[PDB]
Each structure stands twice: as C-alpha cells, then as structure tokens.
Design a protein around this ligand. Structure first.
Ligand SMILES: *[C@H](O)[C@H](C[C@@H]1CCNC1=O)NC(=O)[C@H](CC(C)C)NC(=O)OCc1ccccc1
Ligand SMILES: *[C@H](O)[C@H](C[C@@H]1CCNC1=O)NC(=O)[C@H](CC(C)C)NC(=O)OCc1ccccc1
Lengths: 304, 304
C-alpha cells in the first residue's frame, strides 16, 4: 500500500536531452531522429525578451550559430526552421537513443512527468498536472527551458510539454512539441494572467478513492447527493463541474471500493463546507487534485 | 522559482533492474557487474514467510533454481550466497550498463529516490526520507521487493536502500545493499513496531527557508529564541532536538536569506503552537520534513 506522487522512469527521455546555445543564451533541446526541438527564445538576448520580433531575430541566424552538444559531443546543424514557438534544428546524426515516441497535446486535467534539465543535463523528475487554466506548478530556474514533459505507455514516450516561462504568480507555462502554447500565453516578458485556478474535481474524487483503497476512510459519511446539487457547491469553491463522463471514468474506482460516486461526492461536499478539522488524507491537509483516475489505478495496480 | 519533491533521473538505475524468480515467488534484483542482489525472501513460499528459517530454506536451492531475466534475456546463474537479508547471485555476464556506483548506509533524516519496479521493470520514481524511526513512506505493492533507493552525485550512483516489507502502520522497511535492515526490523511476517515517528526538525527549517527563497514569508515573525528554549517545544511535538551542527548545516540557507536560524526557529515554534490558521506554505497545509538542507540548495541552484 501507500500513495505517492510518482513520475515515470526518465531513462528514455534522458537520452534525448541536448544543450542548445545561440550566442550567450543556453537552454535545453530534445533530440529525436535527426531533429533537435527547442524554445525559439534561445535566439534572444536578455534585452530582446521583453518584445522580441522572432522572425526578424531569426533571420540574422544561420545553422552554424546554433551550437548543439550531446554530452561532450558536438552535433552538426544542417538546417533550421521555426514552427510556432519552437525551433527545429536539423542535425547530420540521427539520435541512436531515439525511443518510440509520439507528440501529443494533452488535455487539461491530465498529468505528465517533467524531466527538469540544465545545460542539456537532467536534474530531476516530478509529476505535473496541466491545470484547467493551462498552467503547471513546477520547479524551474533560469536555463531550464526546453525541459520536456511526457507520459509513457509501455514502450512509447508521448511528449506533451516543453517548458518556456514563469508567470508572475509563480506558475509555469509552455508549449506542446509543435510549439503551440497551452493557454493564452505568448513567449515574451510581459505580465500575463492565467485566470482563476479552478480545481480538477474528478481528480479530487479519484484521490479520495485512492485514500480509501489505502485505508483512509474517516471522511466517508452517511449522505449522498446529485450531480446538480453537488455542482452548486463546486461553483462556490471554484471546482470544475462534474459530469456523467467523470462519473463513468470513476467507475473502476467506485466498483473497486463499493462507494458510489455520488456518495463520495457527498463526502467531498462536507469536506469543502467543513474543512478537514485538523485531520489528514493520505498525508495531506488539503484536497489534492493532481492525480487522475488513471494515475490512481496505475499506481494501485502496479502498471509498468 | 517553485519547489517540488524531485527525484533523481532514474536512467542509470533502470539499466540495472532484473527479474528474479525462485519457484512461484518473483521479485526484482539489482544487476551490477556480474552480481545480482535481491531480497532473500525470494526463496520463500507464501506459507514460509511467517517464520522462515532462511538457512534451511536456502540449502534446498541451487543455482538453476534462481531464474534471472534482464528484459527478455535470461542470465546464467553460476553461484549464490546469502549476506544478511539479501542474496548475491553470481551470473556469467557482467552488466554492460553498470554505472559507477557505491553502496552506502544513509543516515536517518537523509533522502533518496526510489525506483519502484515490478517484474524487473521500472514503474515510477519518487523521493523518500529515511525517517528517524528508520521507516519510509513509500508506495509499494506485492512484487515490488528488490526495488532500490539511491542518490546520484554527478556520475556516481550511491545505492542505499532495497525494499523488503510493509509494517502494519502502512510504512515501509528495508535494507542497505549489504542486507542489513534499517531499524529493528526482521524479514518475517510478524507484527513489528517502528516506534514514535519523530519529525526531522532541521528539514522542516530547510523547507521554511525554501518557502522564503520562493516567496512565501507570512510565517516570519518579530521573535527569536534559543536552542534550549526551542527544543523544549520540539520535545512536546515529537521533533528531533536541534543542535549547532544543524544550525551550521542551515548556514548557506540562512546566509542566502538573511534570516538567522534562531529567528526561523521562532517562526517554527509559533507554527507548532498556533497551527497555520488555514494558510499554506509551498502549497502544503502541514509542516514538511522530507527535504534536507542539501535538497533545498540542490533544487534552488539547479544542480545537475
Ligand atoms: C527559460 O529558461 C526560462 C524559464 C523561466 C526562468 C525562471 N523560471 C522559468 O520558468 N524562461 C524565461 O526566462 C522566459 C523567456 C521569455 C522570452 C518568455 N521569461 C520569463 O519566464 O520571464 C519571467 C521570469 C524570468 C526570470 C526569472 C523569473 C521570472
Ligand atoms: C515484497 O514484494 C513485499 C512488499 C510488501 C507487499 C505489500 N507492500 C510491501 O511493501 N514484501 C512482503 O510481502 C514481506 C515479505 C516477508 C518475508 C517480510 N511481507 C510483508 O511485507 O508483509 C506485510 C504485508 C504483506 C502483504 C500485503 C500487506 C502487508
């Protein structure tokens, strides 16, 4: 037993991380086949980053201006292109460690693993949710851009996130591997708002189910509710409205625990209205919303 | 900015995980050079596990009774020995992916990364502290034994933990890579007590420093204290007594923030006595003690 925020093993992605330097700016790139993907603001000086004209900046750059290093070994850049907010650098060597991979645009409420990197070298790994307001709550310093987020399904790495920036609220923003930002964000150093950070209701319920699967049951009560009545309380607390598809997704955890989803909803309602009275759930004193139902099943079933 | 529980990249350890089956029992092994390390209870049937006589059970086993698989590829076992609570299986092939490595016995209060595995295949990665009562709070199912915990310093993997069992309280217990349990535990299915779970004071302070490094400062007050007076309150709350060596270890975070350690101690005292009044620190509503000072510096400096 036990329940922990758990990242995927990072080995397959470690072998894809390179360093990309353009002038004075160094960040990370993702090397897959003969292409290196990185954030386009690698072509910016610090001054340029407040209002870059990326097309104009990029025109002053040639292949030899992009220094790409895989470990100690320099890669030869033979072409470059800009796709939305990422650069694709073509190199003369296919990465021999390229895993089976896909690029995917994840949906809000889904989770993924971040391999935080500096100077092309991995620093650590942790799980994030793409929040409903299309930000993530990560750990990123100067030099971390180009770090990527991913999921693994057996053998295949689905890359879904590349890191670009931090918002004034301390949350983090980035793109899919085609260079399209999640959310309304642009890669320039202006003040930008993410909007209300609503809570992923279905994930909170999944984590309450995880708590019961793992022995924590004090919050279970004698009440039930309805979707519409629950949601009247979801709105007040800036929770996402719960839908029958959410109910179905919780099916396996509901079946597996014998607790009807709407009964658990009634437990959640009481926790929202009355707090946790100094108690804890799976070692937390807050309602946790960054575990998907799949994450709960995956962990409690030992999926590898 | 941002602060997250962060595991080391697992790639170097992934390449060392194998499957070890003895009869009906399958668990994980660690393959380094021509030796596979695994928990000795792989030789037990389910019945044997309540009161095994390991020496007697092991005498009925020969090399060919240990099936060791690296991915799809069978390894040939050419010798076996029992060292404390682990088996060393000698195989005829040196692991070509063996990293630079050390075996270390970590001290209580230090952290490490767990690569949870099933059937010799990695499932996920997460950070644990060796708690003062020599348990860890992990996520482990049937089949997870032989999963290992480790630290990396640049190129060298220091293995410090191998997983063996779960206590009735839902916490986890295991050995160093020489097979010696952390704590008073034995590998048999009896009820076993870990004792009072005291809190790692120096780590809580480090995490309060991390909170300030990352913008959370509401808990800073106008008070200071002394070591002896602080500890009078540490005892009541089952915190470890704070020592001057702890104070020195916090030196870099104290210097880096301009907050005297004893001033921060006064903040912690008030948080213990008055709770957090519904507020949060680095996204938590509890005082977090599983980050070492080193962990805080490492993360906030981008060590790779
Ligand atoms: C890429 O390495 C970097 C990551 C930032 C730096 C601190 N934490 C992060 O997530 N991105 C930028 O520096 C980004 C570049 C623009 C062209 C979008 N600018 C940015 O995030 O500005 C806000 C900021 C910068 C430096 C420190 C704190 C906030
Ligand atoms: C090794 O795979 C296994 C890991 C346990 C199983 C559930 N969670 C864990 O950490 N260890 C054992 O099964 C261990 C073997 C003895 C010879 C020490 N026995 C054990 O941990 O018993 C308690 C227990 C067993 C099964 C489910 C829940 C608790």
């Amino acid at each position: 037993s036990g329940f922990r925020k758990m990242a995927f093993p990072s080995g397959k992605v470690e072998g894809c991380m390179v360093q990309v330097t353009c002038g004075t700016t160094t960040l990370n790139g993702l090397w897959l086949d003969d292409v290196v993907y990185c954030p386009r603001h690698v072509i910016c000086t610090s001054e340029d980053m407040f209002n870059p004209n990326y097309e104009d900046l990029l025109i002053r750059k040639s292949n030899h201006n992009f220094l790409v290093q895989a470990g100690n070994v320099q890669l030869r850049v033979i072409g470059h292109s800009m796709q939305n907010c990422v650069l694709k650098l073509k190199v003369d060597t296919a990465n021999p460690k390229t895993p089976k991979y896909k690029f995917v645009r994840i949906q809000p409420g889904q989770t993924f693993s971040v391999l935080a990197c500096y100077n092309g070298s991995p620093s650590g790994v942790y799980q994030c949710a793409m929040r409903p307001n299309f930000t993530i709550k990560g750990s990123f310093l100067n030099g971390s851009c180009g770090s990527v987020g991913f999921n693994i399904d057996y053998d295949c790495v689905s890359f879904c996130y590349m890191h670009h920036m931090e918002l004034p609220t301390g949350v983090h923003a980035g793109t899919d591997l085609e260079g399209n930002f999640y959310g309304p964000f642009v890669d320039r150093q202006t003040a930008q708002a993410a909007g209300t950070d609503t809570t992923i209701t279905v994930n909170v319920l999944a984590w309450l189910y995880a708590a019961v699967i793992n022995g924590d049951r004090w919050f279970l009560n004698r009440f039930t509710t309805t979707l519409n009545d629950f949601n009247l309380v979801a709105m007040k607390y800036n929770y996402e409205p719960l839908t029958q598809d959410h109910v179905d997704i919780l099916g396996p955890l509901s079946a597996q625990t014998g607790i009807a989803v709407l009964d658990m909803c009634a437990s959640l309602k009481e926790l929202l209205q009355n707090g946790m009275n100094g108690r804890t759930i799976l070692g937390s004193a807050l309602l946790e919303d960054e575990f998907t139902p799949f994450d709960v099943v995956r962990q409690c079933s030992g999926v590898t």
